[model samples]
Target chain A: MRVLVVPLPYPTHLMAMVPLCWALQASGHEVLIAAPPELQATAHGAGLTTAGIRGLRFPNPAFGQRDTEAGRQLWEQTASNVAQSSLDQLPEYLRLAEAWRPSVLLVDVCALIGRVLGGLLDLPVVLHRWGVDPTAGPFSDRAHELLDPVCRHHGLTGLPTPELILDPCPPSLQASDAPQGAPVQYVPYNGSGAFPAWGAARTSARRVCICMGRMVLNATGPAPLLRAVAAATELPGVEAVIAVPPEHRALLTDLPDNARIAESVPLNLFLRTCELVICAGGSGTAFTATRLGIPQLVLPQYFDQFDYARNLAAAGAGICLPDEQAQSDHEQFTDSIATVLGDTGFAAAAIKLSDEITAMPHPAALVRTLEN
Target chain B: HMRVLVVPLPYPTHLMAMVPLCWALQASGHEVLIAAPPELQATAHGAGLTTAGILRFPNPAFGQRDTEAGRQLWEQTASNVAQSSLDQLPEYLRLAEAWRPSVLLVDVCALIGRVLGGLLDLPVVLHRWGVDPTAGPFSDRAHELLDPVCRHHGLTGLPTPELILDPCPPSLQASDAPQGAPVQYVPYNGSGAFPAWGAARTSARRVCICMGRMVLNATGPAPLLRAVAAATELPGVEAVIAVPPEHRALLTDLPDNARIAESVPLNLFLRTCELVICAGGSGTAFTATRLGIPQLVLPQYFDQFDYARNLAAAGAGICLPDEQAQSDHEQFTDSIATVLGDTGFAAAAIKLSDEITAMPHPAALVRTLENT
Candidate 1:
């Protein structure tokens, strides 16, 4: 069987679909990954058979004001723009589909191009969603309005819908309004690079991993995380590992001896040994910790980051800032670094979510589903 | 119901091959802890496996040079491991006793597995890397160096492993090799992000050239470029060389049809090519077989000659052991053209691929391990 995977080309979106691709390949199916040029390196880095799709502008998860009418309108505009541009990339996507004649299309949640390709090529597609899935629901409606001509251009009368939607996010943490998706276990493949022995050691000392997003790292940022680490190491026998790049080391200064820095270690490498994770509300970072059953403290700034934060906090698996811009003041006993460290309930809740995820069908099991 | 302790030789090639099996165990709800020393911990951690540091050891100096001398180098490496871990070997035993793993999943070359099995009387499962012509000899070699440690620990001999998991497809396995449970070959060479043209289809025939590790280290830079670059002279054939980043800088004079690829895994890159030209290393040879691609092998070492001969006898590839013939343009191009032009070679390659596809995947093999 030949499976073609198309993602939205962002880091989070591309990685979200990789576990299934790996499972298909490992189970004796030929899998090819095609994304916009934005995902070239990431697809290569994941070590899958791949080609880059051309001509479509990949959209950013930019509209932060989730509850506002204006934010919703901006998201609709972004969705429509990608939909309209699919007309330009259709010739190339068709050329690949015609050559490959893939049996299945495993596509990202908001990929307008994949939907058009599936419709024109008469292939079954399985939509793979990320996080609380703040966009896919609306994008589906806008795609029909914007991509009707794309379907008619290839002599189809209407838009295409996927045979099934695969949700890696456990139902306990998913949004209420989102579709009841077919469950597939979330197996994270963040990335791989050189890691040191300290990262491999499972010591008795209490450990916490802090993963900072690009926004927090680059902003003349109030090192909310830097201050959090300083306070975390003050607790007895507690140590911290900061996952940040070397160039940005100056951002996290006046560090304690107990804190170690890993510039290139992926979360899957060290997160299992950690009792708690403090990170930005990025989907991959948040989901990786949850899948490992570790409690998290999320500092969300904007966009789907806030949605990810809200859903996790609602699930009782982690703590979220009251607002996206709120600072971390360890002095406050509630949702503070000291509070989560001392409390055991957060971990208990996270373990249940982990159990939920573990009980879902692993990607390998989905091979028979795609085979049909 | 089980915990498996995995040990691999301290090298990327050794550790990366074990990752697919580890993922299968975790996917099956079994706990796996990889015990790597300081030198190997980075590779294991980078693969995102849960790990523990067993003892301190420097980087391994295993020789990749041509031999019969290869035997002496491995014996030297095995002795060095025994010497390096001698004082701390007891603590490693203590880690096993405390962790209480149900089985020892040991790499054929990681002598510590044999040592630990001798001391604890635990069941050991041995995993073979590829086309394992040397498994029995390698064990005898490891026992030659480390049995004294077993004697010191109240044992007389290294225990025979209860199971040997072989990753070699049957046709390629030496006829004299011992019997074992068959596993489908899943190649995991290292990777990083690529700029573009990862697996894009080409109008011209595509040839993949990867001068394997031994060839790169043993040859002068000038000879190295001449060895790999002249393959582009084949008319209407585009060449993509899967190369090391440092070595890639030296090939600046390559023709427009010949491209340099850094950080792309050969298993993934081989899918786009009509034929692969590589120094006969197990990683490249086994990966090409798993994908059913015809290949031409250039032998740079002693065991490579045997591997090249096996592939040639199987009718899936051609072997050129003569350095003079390999350096000559017409001879090399004619050899490549022979394999690419014959549909019989690809049919024979596909026969081996079908044999591999009939075997249990790592995930399924986990059930077989448990059932036994």
Candidate 2:
């Protein structure tokens, strides 16, 4: 059996679907990820094979703008154009679809062209959703409306819904309005980094892990991390482990005495020791922290990250920064951080979600259905 | 709950071959902790597996030359590494007791892990690093070396594995492949962003120049690189220097037709390549085999000859005699040109990959493992 995986070019989106790819390949089925030249490395980096395909011509839409009416309109303007890239992608998708003749098409929720191509081919299209899919209905409808011409060109009357959806979100972490799908346990696939040693008794200081995603850190620089690290300084007996690249360490000044730089290592490696986490609310971090049962403090950088942050807060397993004065004010951030740490409920809530996830079907468990 | 400790050798190929099985264990709700030296641990980390770093093994000289003295050097080097493992083996055993793993999944080359499993009263499963060669000699060597050490601890003899995982397909497996469950070889090279050439092939014939990671890092890489780079100058052939960023200083000037990369995932990079010119490391040879691509192996060690010999035996690829090719660009290019131009080489390679694809997946085998 051959499974064709199509992930959105973004690292977090691609990572969310990796466990299933592993499950598929582990079952003796060949799994090939098809992405544009830009995202091929990320797909390949997950230890999966990939084919380079066509890329979207339009600049990626700015996703940080859903709050204000002006931002919403600006987003709609770019998003509709982003959807038009589907027309450009259809031929490439067709080429891949016909060449491979995949047994199943496993697509990330946002890779709209996969749905259209697989729909035309009448292949079983399985959608993989990130945690707490608040924007699912809206995004699907918009993609359908925008790519209607593409569907008609492929002889489809309308865009078809997937045969199945593989949702990694546990019930406690899921949004109230999120669609019910075949539940799959959330498995973390943080892009590879060295282990910072492990096992045995820990120090007296409480471990607080600050892992701002590499994308946000690279884009925003050391200021946000410095502030996050600064908040830990306000609380005594806290050992802060901040995931920062070595080159950026010099840029951060007035560092907390207890904080240490954890260069490029995966959160999956060190997150087990930490009692609490502070991160850019990327689904990879949000779900990984949840999977590890660590209470989190989310500082959302953009787009669906805000939704993942809110979902964690709703579950009472995390705190979301209100944005008015989160990163700049060390004391304000420290209060929220302290509140989550001091209160025992957050850890319990996180543990409950972890329990729910453990009881759910693993990606391997879902493979039989995908194959049949 | 099934707790598996993945103990691969410090070498790149040995660690890489074990990755998919490690993932299979994790995907099926088992916990895996990869314990190895720095490079292997880092490689596992790159693939998002949980790992702990241990001490580096002393390789007095992992050399293989046609000369009698060079062959003798490697035999002592192999013994030295095996002996030191017994002395420094405590670090892994400390964690083995701490984690209290149910199964010890080990690399065939590093049966010291099997020794550790014996101490803990746990069953060991050795993962084949190449064509699943029976390690009777390795077992006898280890027993001979460690019998005294175990006699001090009051054991009759070292504990043998409960099972061995054979990853080679029927056409490519050892004649004495040992009695073990068959597993499809899902190639796992180091995960990273694919280089531009890794994802795209702009030439008609691309010959990848990969000398494996450990060799370049330890022995230094000028002469071997220049020799491999020369093979790329053939008509319409583009040579890819698939070395990592850490070893960039080893590479100097190359021909105009070369496409250099900071890193290359063997499995992914081989997809766009017609033939690979490498040091016959199992990671490269098997990756090419599973992808149905022919290779020209320049064997750098005595053990590496097993992979080259088998592939050549199966009519899939050829192994260069040590004395003839490392310094002779003429022989290397002639071999490269022959493999690329011949259809018979690719046909046999494809047969092996097809046979490999028919083998049971790790997920099914994982279930078999526990019940048996």
Candidate 3:
């Protein structure tokens, strides 16, 4: 069995796919990673054979726009434009399929190639959605109605529109959660290994990891969030590892004396060094931290983060500050961190949630599916 | 003090093997720069190494690009880099002309160490992460076909070079060695923490699956998967598989019959599982044999043929041709099952693992180059 994995080049998506690639190889299948050329090395480093694909990118400022039809249009326009240009890259996609003759295509939702080529090749393409499942939103019914036409227009078939509506995340996250169609391949974001000794050694201190999601996504400052973290790090016994833009070195003009700036430490390496983390809510970062049972302070920067933070808060893992209120007051951000990290109830709840996430379906099960 | 720059043009796994070698060179007081695409800059930076650009397509590093043309473009990018490096020989020559370093360590993709060494009047060593460049009896035939193209481009016939610095253990070596490239097997120690599993135990019937860690992310080979699945049913054999994260998704609803697991350290996994099953990649196979586990290799790609043949020649494993195996999955699987049950194959696997364990810790190989 030969399979082609099409993951978005970002670390979060690449990280998501890494474990699955291993499962396939372990089961004795040939796995080929069809990623952008830039991602080839890291993909290969993670142990997947490489096939190059091209993509189009649209750069935008990182600011949370209020919900309005106009804003939605802007978002769609930007994303669609990027996808449209990538349509030209389809030739490489077709060529690779012809050459590899892959039996299945596991693709990132953003790639959109799965819907296009899966039909032509008669391959079972399992769309591996990362971070957000828009259909899981409150208006899921309306969302499905909107997407069904788009999905059909793109060549998807063989499923009732209702069943395809963002199925609840796999049972790993929810105690009794189950999917109706194929079993949901719940790929929880278990970050790469960390130095356990760091966590153990710092057991006495109230350590916090102040990480911004992927720098690639949020290029601007969650200034209020940063300022709040700077103050929290000053509280006695509360050490903070602030991961921020290299340009933000001067942002902390009146910096907390105790706050250590971990600019050079890798995100995975730095996350392991702390007990709790203070940051703007990004899906991958939040998923990674919460899944690890590391408490979080979410200053919602945008839509997905706001949604993810809400999910965490609902899960009793952490708190998401009211976006409008936090925008004006830095104290709101700091207070949320203090409350979540210090509250016994939140801590216990977080531990339970983390345990559930850890128990979620390990990606290795995909190997069996690939074999079948 | 001297300075050496090593870059891997093939893949990041190749980069992993080169990393520690660069560390030894730098630790002994030399400056080293790892050249990789910016997307992988994080990995090198994580290791506290400085980086240089190896310009690749899709700068942001995610999503798909259009195929053969793009891949051809990438191949062109690689060839251009090679051509440019050769064209700019005077610059490096001037640096060598300035410091006159005693030696130069190069990756296989750079492919000009001998010419560069002669031009700079320094000892040149060719570095390989898998099979010795000259030891591919089975696949060397394909490699041989590439010889005319090499000479056509003003390159010498086959892989002609002085002293092959391979990061594979002796157990993984081929049964036959080509004339003229004196081979020295070097233990691969790209990892800082995992102790070589070869350091422990002797005379055990182990069945190891050298999973490429990311296979579960996609589909792999049928013969390969069936072989490992078959091993679990064997009587006195112990089996272990090393799984990286994303592929862990496959573990969701596992087949009750399959004896497979995720999360064991690779070094330990190899020592425990003797009948190694892999898609003939380098690190896992070398690590297993170094620990005295004979392998059953399914060559899924072009380069793997080289590694598979070498391991077979060294009496370490059975190298199954991919075409024949892939063409008839059921038959191919049975052949592997038969090999695993063979008493002669089991004894040879142990002997090969022992021979590999005796080779110098690959670190010494780098030290020798840097010290010169």
How do the predictions measure up, each by TM-score? 0.81, 0.79, 0.48
Candidate 1 docking category? incorrect
Worst lDDT run of 10 residues, candidate 2 chain B, spans B55-64
Off by over 4 Å in 3: A37-49, A56-79, A136-199, A216-218, A222-225, A244-254, A264-273, B1-372
How well is each residue in A148-167 modelled by candidate 2, as lDDT tens digits?
A: 76678778887887898888
How many angstroms is residue A179 displaced in model 1 relative to the true structure, after the best TM-score fit?
A: 1.1
What docking grade applies to model 3? incorrect
TM-score of chain A of 2: 0.90
The all-Cα superposition gives candidate 2 an RMSD in Å to the true structure of 6.0
- Supply DockQ values for each candidate: 0.21, 0.34, 0.02
Instruction: Provide fnat values for all models in the order shown.
Output: 0.13, 0.54, 0.00
Ranking by lDDT: 2, 1, 3
Steric collisions counted per model: 0, 2, 63
Residue-by-residue lDDT tens digits, candidate 3, B163-217: 6565455444444533222223333322222222333433544565555533333
- What is the lDDT, from 0 to 100, of the residue A37 in candidate 3? 59
